[PDB]
């Protein structure tokens, strides 16, 4: 019974860390996408100064 209880507690710990890793990864996707939008807007500004 004690070993089964330890295994169950390990299962909840795995599920918790997996959920938070998924949350971090899904936020990283959008953070990198926002950085890419900032980079393309920076390229547009460089084109604006060069055409100026």
């Amino acid at each position: 019974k004690s070993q089964s209880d330890v295994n169950k507690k390990l299962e909840q710990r795995l599920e918790e860390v997996r959920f938070w890793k998924k949350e971090l990864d899904d936020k990283l996707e959008q953070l990198v996408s926002a950085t890419e939008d900032l980079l393309i807007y920076q390229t547009r500004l460089e084109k604006a100064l060069e055409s100026l």
Binding site: L10, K21, L24, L31, A34, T35, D37, L38, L45
Partner: protein, 105 residues
């Protein structure tokens, strides 16, 4: 450029925490896949000890939540600057076109 720097700093911290999550996950997978007759199981040492660099569950969840909300806040700032930059470019193009037209007239 400053907003890109802030986004990349948030990227660095978030990637730090994510690879820490992966190595903790593989440690816990090895822990969970340990049966009674598995090999490489051995007598330990002092072992049973609350670690002097350990943190609490509430502190761990607070750290993860703070990282997520910091990244989301920087994304919100990025979208706000995106709208501001779009307005600035449109205004600059309109002013230059109108001034060139009135000079030609």
């Amino acid at each position: 450029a400053e907003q890109i720097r802030l986004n990349r700093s948030a990227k660095y911290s978030l990637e730090k925490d994510l690879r820490d999550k992966f190595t903790a996950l593989t440690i816990d997978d090895i822990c969970f896949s340990l049966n009674n007759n598995s090999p490489n199981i051995r007598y330990s040492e002092n072992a049973v000890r609350i670690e002097p660099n350990s943190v609490s569950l509430e502190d761990w969840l607070d750290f993860s939540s703070t990282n997520v909300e910091k990244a989301d806040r920087q994304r919100n700032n990025s979208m706000t600057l995106k709208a501001l930059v779009d307005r600035i470019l449109s205004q600059t193009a309109s002013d230059l076109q109108r001034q060139c037209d009135v000079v030609d007239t």
